[PDB]
Short mmCIF file of C-alpha atoms and ligand atoms in Angstrom, two decimals:
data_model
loop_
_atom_site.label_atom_id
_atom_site.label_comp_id
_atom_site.label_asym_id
_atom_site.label_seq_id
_atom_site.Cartn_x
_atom_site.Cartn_y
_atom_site.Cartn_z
CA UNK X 146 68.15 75.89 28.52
CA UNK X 147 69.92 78.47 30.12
CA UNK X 148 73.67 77.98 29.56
CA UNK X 149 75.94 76.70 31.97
CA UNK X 150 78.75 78.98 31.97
CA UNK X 151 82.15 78.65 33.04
CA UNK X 152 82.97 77.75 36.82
CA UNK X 153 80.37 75.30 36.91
CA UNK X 154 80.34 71.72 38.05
CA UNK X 155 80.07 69.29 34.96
CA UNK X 156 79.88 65.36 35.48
CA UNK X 157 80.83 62.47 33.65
CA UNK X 158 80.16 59.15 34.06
CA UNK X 159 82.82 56.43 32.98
CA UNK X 160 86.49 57.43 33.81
CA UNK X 161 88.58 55.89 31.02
CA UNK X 162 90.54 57.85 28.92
CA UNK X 163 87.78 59.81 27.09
CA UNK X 164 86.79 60.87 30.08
CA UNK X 165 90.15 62.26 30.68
CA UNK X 166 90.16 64.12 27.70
CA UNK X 167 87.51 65.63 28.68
CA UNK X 168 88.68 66.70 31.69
CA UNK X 169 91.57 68.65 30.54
CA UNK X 170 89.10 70.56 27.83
CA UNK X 171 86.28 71.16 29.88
CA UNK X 172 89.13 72.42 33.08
CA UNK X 173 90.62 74.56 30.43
CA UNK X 174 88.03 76.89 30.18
CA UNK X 175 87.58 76.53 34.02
CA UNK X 176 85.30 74.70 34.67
CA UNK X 177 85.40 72.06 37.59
CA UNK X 178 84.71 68.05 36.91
CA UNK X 179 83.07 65.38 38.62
CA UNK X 180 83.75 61.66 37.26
CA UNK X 181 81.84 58.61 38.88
CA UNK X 182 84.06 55.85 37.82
CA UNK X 183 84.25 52.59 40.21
CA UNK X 184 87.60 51.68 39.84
CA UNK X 185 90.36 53.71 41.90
CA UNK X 186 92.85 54.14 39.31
CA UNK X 187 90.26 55.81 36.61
CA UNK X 188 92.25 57.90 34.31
CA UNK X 189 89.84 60.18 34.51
CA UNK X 190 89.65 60.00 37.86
CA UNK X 191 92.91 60.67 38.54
CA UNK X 192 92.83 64.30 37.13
CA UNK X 193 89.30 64.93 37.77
CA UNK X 194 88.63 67.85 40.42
CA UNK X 195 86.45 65.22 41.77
CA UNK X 196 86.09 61.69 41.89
CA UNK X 197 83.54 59.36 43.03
CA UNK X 198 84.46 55.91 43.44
CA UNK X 199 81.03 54.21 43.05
CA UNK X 200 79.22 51.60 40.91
CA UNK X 201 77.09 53.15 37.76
CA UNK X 202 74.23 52.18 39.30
CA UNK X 203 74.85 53.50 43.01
CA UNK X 204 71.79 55.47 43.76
CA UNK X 205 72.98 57.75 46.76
CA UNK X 206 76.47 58.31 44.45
CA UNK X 207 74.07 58.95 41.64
CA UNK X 208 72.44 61.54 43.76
CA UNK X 209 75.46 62.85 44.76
CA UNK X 210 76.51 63.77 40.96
CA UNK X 211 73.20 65.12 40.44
CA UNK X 212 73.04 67.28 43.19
CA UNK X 213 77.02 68.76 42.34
CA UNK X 214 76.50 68.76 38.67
CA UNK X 215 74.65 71.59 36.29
CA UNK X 216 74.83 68.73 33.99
CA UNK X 217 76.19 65.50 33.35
CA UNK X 218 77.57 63.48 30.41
CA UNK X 219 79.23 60.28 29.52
CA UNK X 220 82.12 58.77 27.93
CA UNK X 221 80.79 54.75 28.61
CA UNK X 222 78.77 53.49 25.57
CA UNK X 223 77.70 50.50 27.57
CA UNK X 224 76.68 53.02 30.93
CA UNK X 225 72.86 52.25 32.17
CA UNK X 226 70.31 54.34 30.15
CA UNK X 227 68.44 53.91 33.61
CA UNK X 228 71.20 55.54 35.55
CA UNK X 229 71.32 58.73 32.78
CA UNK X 230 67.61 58.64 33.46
CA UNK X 231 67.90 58.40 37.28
CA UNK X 232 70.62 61.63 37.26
CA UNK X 233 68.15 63.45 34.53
CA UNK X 234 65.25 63.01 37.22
CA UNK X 235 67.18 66.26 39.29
CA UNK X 236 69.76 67.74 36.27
CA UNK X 237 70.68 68.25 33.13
CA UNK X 238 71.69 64.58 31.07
CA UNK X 239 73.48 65.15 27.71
CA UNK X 240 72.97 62.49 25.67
CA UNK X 241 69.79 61.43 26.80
CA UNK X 242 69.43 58.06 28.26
CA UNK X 243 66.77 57.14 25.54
CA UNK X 244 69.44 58.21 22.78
CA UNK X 245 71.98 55.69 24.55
CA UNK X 246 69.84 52.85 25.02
CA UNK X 247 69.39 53.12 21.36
CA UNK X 248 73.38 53.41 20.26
CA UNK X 249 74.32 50.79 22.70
CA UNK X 250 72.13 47.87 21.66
CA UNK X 251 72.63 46.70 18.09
CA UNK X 252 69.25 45.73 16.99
CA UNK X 253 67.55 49.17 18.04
CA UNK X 254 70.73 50.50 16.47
CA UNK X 255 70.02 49.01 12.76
CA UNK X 256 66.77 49.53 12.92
CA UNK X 257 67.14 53.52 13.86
CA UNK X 258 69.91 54.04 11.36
CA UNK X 259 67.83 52.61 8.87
CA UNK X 260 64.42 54.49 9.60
CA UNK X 261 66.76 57.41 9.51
CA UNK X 262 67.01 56.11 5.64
CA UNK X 263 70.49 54.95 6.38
CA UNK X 264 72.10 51.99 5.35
CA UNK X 265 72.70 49.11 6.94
CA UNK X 266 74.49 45.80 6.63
CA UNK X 267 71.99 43.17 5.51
CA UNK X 268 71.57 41.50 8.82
CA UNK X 269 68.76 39.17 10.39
CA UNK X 270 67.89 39.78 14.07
CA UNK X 271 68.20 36.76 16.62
CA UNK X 272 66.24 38.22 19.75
CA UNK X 273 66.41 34.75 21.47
CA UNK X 274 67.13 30.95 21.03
CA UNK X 275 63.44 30.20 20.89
CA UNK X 276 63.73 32.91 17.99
CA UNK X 277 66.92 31.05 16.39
CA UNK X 278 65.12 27.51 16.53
CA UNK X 279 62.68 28.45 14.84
CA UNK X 280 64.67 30.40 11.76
CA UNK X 281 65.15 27.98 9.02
CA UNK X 282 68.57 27.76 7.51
CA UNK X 283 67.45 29.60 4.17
CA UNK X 284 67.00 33.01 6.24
CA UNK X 285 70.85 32.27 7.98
CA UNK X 286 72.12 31.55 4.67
CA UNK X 287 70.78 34.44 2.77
CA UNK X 288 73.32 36.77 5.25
CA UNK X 289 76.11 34.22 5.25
CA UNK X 290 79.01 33.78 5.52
CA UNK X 291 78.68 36.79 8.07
CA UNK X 292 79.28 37.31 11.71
CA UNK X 293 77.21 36.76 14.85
CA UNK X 294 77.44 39.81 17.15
CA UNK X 295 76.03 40.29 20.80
CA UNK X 296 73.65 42.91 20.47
CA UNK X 297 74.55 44.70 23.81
CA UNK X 298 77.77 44.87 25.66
CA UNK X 299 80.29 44.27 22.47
CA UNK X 300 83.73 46.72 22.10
CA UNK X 301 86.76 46.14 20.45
CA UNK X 302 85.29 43.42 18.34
CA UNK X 303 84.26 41.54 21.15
CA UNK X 304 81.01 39.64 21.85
CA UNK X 305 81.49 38.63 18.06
CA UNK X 306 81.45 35.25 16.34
CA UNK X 307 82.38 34.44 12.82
CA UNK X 308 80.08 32.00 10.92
CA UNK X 309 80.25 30.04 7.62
CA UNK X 310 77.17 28.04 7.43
CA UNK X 311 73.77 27.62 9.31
CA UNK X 312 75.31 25.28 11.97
CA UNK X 313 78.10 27.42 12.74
CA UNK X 314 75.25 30.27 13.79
CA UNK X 315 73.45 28.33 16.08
CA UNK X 316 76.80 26.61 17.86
CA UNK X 317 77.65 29.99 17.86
CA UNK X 318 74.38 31.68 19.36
CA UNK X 319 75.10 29.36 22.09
CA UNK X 320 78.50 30.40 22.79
CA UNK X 321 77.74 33.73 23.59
CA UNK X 322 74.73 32.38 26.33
CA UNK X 323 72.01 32.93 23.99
CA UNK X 324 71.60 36.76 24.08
CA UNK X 325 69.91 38.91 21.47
CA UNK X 326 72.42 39.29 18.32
CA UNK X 327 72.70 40.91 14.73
CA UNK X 328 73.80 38.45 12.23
CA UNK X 329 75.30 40.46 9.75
CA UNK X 330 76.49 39.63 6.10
CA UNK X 331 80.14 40.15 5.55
CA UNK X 332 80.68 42.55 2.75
CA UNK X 333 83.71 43.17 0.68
CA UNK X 334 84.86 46.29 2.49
CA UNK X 335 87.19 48.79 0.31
CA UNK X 336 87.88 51.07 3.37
CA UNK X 337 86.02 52.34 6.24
CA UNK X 338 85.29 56.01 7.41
CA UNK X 339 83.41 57.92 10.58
CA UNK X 340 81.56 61.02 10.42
CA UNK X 341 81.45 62.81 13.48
CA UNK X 342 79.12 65.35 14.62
CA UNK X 343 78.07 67.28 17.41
CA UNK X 344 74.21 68.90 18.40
CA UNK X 345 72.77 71.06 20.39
CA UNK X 346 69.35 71.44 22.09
CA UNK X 347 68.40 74.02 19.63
CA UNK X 348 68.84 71.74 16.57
CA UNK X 349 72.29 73.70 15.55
CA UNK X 350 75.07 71.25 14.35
CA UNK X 351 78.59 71.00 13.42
CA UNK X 352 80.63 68.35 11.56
CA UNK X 353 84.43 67.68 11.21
CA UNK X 354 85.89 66.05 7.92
CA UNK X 355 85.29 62.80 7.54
CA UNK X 356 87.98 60.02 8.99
CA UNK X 357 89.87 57.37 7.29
CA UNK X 358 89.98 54.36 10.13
CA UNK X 359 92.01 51.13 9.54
CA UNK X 360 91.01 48.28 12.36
CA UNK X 361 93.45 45.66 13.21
CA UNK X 362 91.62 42.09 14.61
CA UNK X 363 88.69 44.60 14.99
CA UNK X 364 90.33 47.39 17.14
CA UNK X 365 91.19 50.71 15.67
CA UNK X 366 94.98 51.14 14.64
CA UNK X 367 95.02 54.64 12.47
CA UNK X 368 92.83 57.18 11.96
CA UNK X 369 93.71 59.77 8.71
CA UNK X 370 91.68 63.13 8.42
CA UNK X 371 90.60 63.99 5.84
CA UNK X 372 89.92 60.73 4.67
CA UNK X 373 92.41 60.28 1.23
CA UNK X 374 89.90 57.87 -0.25
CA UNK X 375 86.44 60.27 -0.27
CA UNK X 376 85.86 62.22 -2.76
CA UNK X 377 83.46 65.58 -1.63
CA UNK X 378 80.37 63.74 -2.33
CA UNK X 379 80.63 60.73 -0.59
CA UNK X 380 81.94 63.15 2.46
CA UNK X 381 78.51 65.00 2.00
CA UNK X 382 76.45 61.91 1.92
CA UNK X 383 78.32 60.44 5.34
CA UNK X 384 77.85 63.82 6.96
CA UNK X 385 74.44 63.91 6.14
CA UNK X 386 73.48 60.85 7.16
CA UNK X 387 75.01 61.19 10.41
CA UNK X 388 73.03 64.45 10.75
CA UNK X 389 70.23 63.09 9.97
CA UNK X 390 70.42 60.01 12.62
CA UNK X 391 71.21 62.48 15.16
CA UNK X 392 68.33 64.84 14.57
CA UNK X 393 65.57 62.36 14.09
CA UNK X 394 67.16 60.95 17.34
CA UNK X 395 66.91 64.12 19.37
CA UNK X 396 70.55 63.80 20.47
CA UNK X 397 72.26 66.34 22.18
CA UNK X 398 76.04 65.97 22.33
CA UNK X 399 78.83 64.57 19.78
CA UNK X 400 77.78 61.71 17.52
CA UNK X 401 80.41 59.06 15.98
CA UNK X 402 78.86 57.22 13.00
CA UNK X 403 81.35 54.48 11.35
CA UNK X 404 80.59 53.72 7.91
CA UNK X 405 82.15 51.26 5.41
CA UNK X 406 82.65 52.03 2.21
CA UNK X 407 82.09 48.79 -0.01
CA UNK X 408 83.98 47.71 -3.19
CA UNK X 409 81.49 48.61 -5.57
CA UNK X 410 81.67 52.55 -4.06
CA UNK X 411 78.30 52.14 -1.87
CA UNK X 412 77.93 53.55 2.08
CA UNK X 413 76.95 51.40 4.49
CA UNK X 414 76.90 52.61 8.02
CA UNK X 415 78.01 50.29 10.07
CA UNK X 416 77.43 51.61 14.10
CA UNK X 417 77.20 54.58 16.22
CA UNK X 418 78.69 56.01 19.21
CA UNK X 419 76.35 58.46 21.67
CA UNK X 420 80.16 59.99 22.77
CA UNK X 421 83.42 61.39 21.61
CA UNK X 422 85.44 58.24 19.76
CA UNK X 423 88.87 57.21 19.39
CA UNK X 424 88.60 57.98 15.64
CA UNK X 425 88.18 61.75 16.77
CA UNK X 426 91.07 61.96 18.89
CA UNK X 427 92.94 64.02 16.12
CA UNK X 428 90.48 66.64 16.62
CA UNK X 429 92.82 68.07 19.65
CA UNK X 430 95.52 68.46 17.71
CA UNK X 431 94.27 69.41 14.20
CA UNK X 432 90.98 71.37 14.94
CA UNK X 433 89.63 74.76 16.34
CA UNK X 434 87.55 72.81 18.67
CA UNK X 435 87.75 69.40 19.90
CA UNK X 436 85.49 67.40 20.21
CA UNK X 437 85.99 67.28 24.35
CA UNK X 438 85.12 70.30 23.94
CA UNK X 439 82.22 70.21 21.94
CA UNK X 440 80.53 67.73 24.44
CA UNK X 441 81.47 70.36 27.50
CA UNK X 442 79.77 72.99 24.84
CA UNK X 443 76.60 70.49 23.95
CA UNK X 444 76.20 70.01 27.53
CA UNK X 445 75.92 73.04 28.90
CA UNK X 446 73.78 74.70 26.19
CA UNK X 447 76.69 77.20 24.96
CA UNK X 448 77.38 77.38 20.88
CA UNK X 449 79.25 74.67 19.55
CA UNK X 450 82.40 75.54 18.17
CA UNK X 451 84.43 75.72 15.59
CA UNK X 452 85.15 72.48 13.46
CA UNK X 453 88.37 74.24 11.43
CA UNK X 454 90.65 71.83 10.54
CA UNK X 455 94.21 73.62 10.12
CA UNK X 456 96.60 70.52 10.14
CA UNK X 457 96.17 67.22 8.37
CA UNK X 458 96.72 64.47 10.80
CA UNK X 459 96.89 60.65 11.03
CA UNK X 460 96.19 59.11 14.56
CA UNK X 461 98.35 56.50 15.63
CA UNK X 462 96.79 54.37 18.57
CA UNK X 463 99.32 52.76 21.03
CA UNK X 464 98.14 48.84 22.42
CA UNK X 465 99.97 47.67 25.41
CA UNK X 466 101.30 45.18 23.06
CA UNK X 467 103.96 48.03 22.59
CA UNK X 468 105.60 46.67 25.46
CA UNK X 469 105.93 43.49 24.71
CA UNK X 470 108.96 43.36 21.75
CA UNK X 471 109.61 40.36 22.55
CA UNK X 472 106.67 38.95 22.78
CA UNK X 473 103.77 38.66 25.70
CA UNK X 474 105.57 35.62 27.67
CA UNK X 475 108.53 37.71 27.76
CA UNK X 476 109.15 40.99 30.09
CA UNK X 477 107.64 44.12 29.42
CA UNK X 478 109.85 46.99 27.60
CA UNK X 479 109.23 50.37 28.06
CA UNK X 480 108.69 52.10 24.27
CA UNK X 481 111.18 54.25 23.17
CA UNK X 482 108.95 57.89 23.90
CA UNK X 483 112.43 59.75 23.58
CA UNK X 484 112.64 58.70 19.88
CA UNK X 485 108.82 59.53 19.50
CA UNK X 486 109.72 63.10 21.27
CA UNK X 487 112.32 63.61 18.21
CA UNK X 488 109.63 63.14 15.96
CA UNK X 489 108.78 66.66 14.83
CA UNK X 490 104.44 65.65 13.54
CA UNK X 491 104.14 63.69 16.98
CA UNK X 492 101.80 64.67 19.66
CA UNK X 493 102.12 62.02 22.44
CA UNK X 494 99.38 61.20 24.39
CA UNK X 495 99.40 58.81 27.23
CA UNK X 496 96.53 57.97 29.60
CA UNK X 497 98.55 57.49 32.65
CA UNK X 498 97.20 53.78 32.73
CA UNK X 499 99.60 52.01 35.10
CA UNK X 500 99.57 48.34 33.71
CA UNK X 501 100.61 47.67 29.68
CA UNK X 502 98.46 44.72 28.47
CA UNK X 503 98.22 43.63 25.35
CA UNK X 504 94.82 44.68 23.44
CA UNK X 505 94.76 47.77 26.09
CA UNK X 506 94.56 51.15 25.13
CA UNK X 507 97.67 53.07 26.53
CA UNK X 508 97.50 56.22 24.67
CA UNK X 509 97.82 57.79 21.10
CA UNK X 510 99.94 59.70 18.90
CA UNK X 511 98.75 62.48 16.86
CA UNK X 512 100.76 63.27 13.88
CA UNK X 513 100.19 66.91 12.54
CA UNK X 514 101.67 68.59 9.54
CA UNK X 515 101.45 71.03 6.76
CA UNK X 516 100.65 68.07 4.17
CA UNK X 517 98.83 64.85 4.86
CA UNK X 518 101.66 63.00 2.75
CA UNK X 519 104.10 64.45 5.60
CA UNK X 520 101.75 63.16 8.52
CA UNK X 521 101.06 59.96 6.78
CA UNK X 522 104.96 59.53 6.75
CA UNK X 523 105.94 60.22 10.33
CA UNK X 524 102.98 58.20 11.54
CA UNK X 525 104.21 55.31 9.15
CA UNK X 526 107.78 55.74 10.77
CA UNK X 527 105.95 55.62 14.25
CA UNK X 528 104.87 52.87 13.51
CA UNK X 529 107.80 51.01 12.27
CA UNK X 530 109.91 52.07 15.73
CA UNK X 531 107.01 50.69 18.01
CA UNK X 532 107.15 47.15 15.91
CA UNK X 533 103.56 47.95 14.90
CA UNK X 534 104.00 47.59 11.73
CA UNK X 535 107.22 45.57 10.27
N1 LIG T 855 79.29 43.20 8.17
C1 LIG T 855 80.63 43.32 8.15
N2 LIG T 855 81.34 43.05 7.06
C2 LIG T 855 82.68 43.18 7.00
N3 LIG T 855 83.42 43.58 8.04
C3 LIG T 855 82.82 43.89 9.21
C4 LIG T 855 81.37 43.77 9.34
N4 LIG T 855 81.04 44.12 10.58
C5 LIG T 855 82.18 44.46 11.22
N5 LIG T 855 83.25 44.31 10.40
C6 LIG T 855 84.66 44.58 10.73
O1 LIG T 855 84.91 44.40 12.12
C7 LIG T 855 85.21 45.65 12.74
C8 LIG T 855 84.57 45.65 14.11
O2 LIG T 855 83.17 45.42 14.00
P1 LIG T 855 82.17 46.36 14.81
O3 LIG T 855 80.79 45.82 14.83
O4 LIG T 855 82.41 47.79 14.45
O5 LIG T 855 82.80 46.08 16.29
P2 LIG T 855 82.76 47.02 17.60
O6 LIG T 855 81.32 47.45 17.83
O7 LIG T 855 83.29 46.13 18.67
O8 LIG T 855 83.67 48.19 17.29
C9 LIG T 855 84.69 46.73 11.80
O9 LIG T 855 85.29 48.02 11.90
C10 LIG T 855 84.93 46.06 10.45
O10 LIG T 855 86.27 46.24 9.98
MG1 LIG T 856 76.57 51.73 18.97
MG1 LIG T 857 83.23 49.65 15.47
#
């Protein structure tokens, strides 16, 4: 692999926000950016030096990337492993399509992680509704009271089903049209953590410090780095394992691996990402390199960089519900960004996203400082002006 070097074309496919951010990192140390996104007010798009408005699987717009692109990369968990395999027929795909098809679909998920000797939630597969009928209640029970989850196509907690009792599972298999599911055992969680990694071709790796992540109704609210609540070996054994998922997987690019961390002190990891994550955002204020830019380095075959951390931080992610104060039958209020300004920790980030609606992602707020305590404060604060927290 020859390296790509700067001044190159580099694609992405998915134009939210992550791709965005990695826009601005891989344009920073000039390179130019294509995004195929079909919707015309991608974030990504709208700063990309390109943008092709197309569907993901649009062969002549596929070509099109191909053709521009030294390589190409995505930020859309849920993107087409055929269409990364279509694009890798004429350049260079980072991660593969076969490392996404695994990531993206639940049951090939668990049972990767856990031939990578890995953890996982105990969990019985559901491939079908002929599979379910014939499942007696005993194997439900022995993983209940737990939750039904889609096994493709499931963010932000959708796609997922709670479930108290062998009747519940099967009402519930049917409510989400009978697709393949996990039905996972829910565990008495303590807190829950992300390792994130990035690899190259070569087999050389970097990791960052492990993250602290607090969900609200299953979307990530806060991120704190390094995580307060792991002590140096369980941050070794979550590092590891993440490394050791992404070499036996052949991956090439940044790795997210969430883990939960269960009352009686035991790792359990819990799902991957084949792409930068939200839980890394702190990485471009707090780190040498960010993790944009470690994907731009991953993809182009240059060295990785640096993982330094030289600020604690705590990530604050901002929900459209932010401008709703008064509720979401009520008018939309603009947040108060001024007061957020005066905060001295606070790194605003806003995705230029048009529309506030509640549950959607409208930006973040890094909070950097000398001490974590400090950071943990301000974000706390944040938090407290934007009615997040009370
Ligand atoms: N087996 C489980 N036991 C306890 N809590 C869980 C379990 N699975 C998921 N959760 C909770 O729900 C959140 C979202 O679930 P997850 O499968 O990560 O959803 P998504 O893939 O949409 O992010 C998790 O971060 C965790 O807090
Ligand atoms: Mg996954
Ligand atoms: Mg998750």
């Amino acid at each position: 692999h020859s390296p790509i070097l700067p001044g190159a074309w580099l694609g992405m496919v998915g134009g939210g926000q992550l791709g965005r951010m990695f826009c601005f990192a891989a344009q920073a140390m000039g390179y130019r950016v294509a995004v195929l996104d079909p919707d015309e007010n991608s974030p990504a798009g709208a700063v990309a030096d390109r943008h092709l408005r197309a569907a993901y699987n649009d062969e002549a717009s596929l070509t099109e990337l191909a053709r521009l692109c030294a390589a190409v990369s995505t930020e859309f968990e849920n993107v087409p492993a055929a269409s990364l395999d279509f694009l890798a027929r004429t350049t260079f795909v980072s991660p593969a399509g076969r490392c996404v098809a695994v990531a993206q679909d639940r049951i090939a998920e668990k049972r990767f992680i856990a031939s990578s000797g890995v953890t996982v939630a105990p969990h019985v597969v559901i491939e079908s509704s002929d599979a379910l009928a014939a499942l007696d209640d005993a194997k439900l029970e022995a993983v209940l009271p737990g939750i039904l989850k889609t096994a493709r196509m499931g963010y932000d907690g959708k796609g997922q089903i709670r479930v108290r009792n062998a009747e519940e599972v099967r009402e519930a298999h049917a409510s989400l049209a009978g697709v393949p599911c996990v039905l996972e055992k829910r565990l008495p969680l303590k807190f829950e953590v992300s390792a994130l990694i990035a690899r190259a071709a070569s087999g050389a790796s970097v990791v960052y410090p492990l993250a602290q992540n607090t969900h609200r109704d299953g979307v990530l609210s806060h991120t704190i780095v390094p995580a307060p609540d792991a002590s140096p070996t369980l941050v070794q054994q979550a590092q590891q394992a993440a490394l050791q998922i992404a070499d036996k997987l052949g991956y090439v690019g940044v790795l997210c691996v969430e883990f939960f961390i269960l009352e009686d002190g035991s790792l359990v990891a819990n799902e991957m990402a084949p792409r930068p994550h939200n839980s890394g955002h702190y990485t471009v204020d707090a780190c040498a390199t960010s993790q944009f830019e470690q994907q731009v380095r991953a993809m182009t075959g240059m060295p990785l960089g640096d993982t330094r951390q030289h600020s604690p931080a705590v990530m604050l992610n901002i929900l459209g519900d932010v401008w709703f104060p008064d509720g979401p039958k009520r008018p939309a209020v603009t947040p108060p960004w001024q007061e957020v300004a005066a905060m001295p920790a606070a790194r605003l980030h806003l995705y230029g996203k048009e529309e506030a609606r509640c549950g959607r992602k409208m930006g973040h707020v890094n909070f950097t400082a000398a001490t974590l305590e400090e950071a943990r404060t301000a974000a706390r604060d944040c938090a407290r002006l934007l009615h997040i927290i009370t």
